[PDB]
Design a protein around this nucleic acid. Structure first.
Ligand SMILES: [Cl-]
Ligand SMILES: [Cl-]
Ligand SMILES: [Mg+2]
Ligand code: NA
Ligand code: NA
Length: 153
RNA sequence: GGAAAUUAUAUUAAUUUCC
């Protein structure tokens, strides 16, 4: 039905329609490792403070980094149920990384699984080779992406 | 039809805007 270019443009439109973002393989990897740096020890941050922590540190290598773009990455993890959220009446909620997502491998798998879930919600059928290219810019994460698809079905 | 920024406690709702 759709060629690869069409599947890709429709995938990123569906991601952006949920207030989520993928910043590209290198920038997304660094954004997620900064989320881990802030939260792996169980610190409880508001969205404001997590976004500040990650943006200003990305900015030198990735001048495109904004509150908006990094907020959209944090929203992808939020939609993925990666955070334990503490509500505070008439105040900002605090967020902690659930214990099972306090390594890069586990957090990155949950992140990837959520983008595949968005593809499934949007009716976009994308093969593991295209997923590896989209999320990693290489063909060395095909088996990883295949595993994620099969665990979602 | 697509994109960016900005706001918010968002499994999200809007605003503004340079195609
Ligand atoms: Cl498939
Ligand atoms: Cl935007
Ligand atoms: Mg505005
Ligand atoms: Na939104
Ligand atoms: Na969450």
């Amino acid at each position: 039905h759709q060629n690869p270019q069409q599947l890709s443009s429709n995938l990123w439109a569906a991601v952006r329609a949920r207030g989520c973002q993928f910043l590209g393989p290198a920038m997304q990897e660094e954004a997620l490792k900064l989320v881990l740096l802030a939260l792996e020890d169980g610190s409880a941050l508001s969205r404001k403070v997590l976004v500040l922590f990650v943006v200003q540190r990305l900015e030198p290598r990735f001048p495109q980094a904004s509150k908006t773009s990094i907020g959209h990455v944090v929203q992808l993890l939020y939609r993925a149920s990666c955070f334990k959220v503490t509500k505070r009446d008439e105040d900002s909620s605090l967020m902690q990384l659930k214990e099972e997502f306090r390594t890069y491998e586990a957090l990155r798998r949950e992140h990837d699984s959520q983008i595949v879930q968005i593809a499934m919600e949007a009716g976009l059928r994308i093969a593991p080779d295209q997923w590896s290219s989209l999320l990693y810019g290489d063909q060395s994460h095909k088996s990883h992406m295949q595993s994620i698809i099969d665990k979602l079905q």
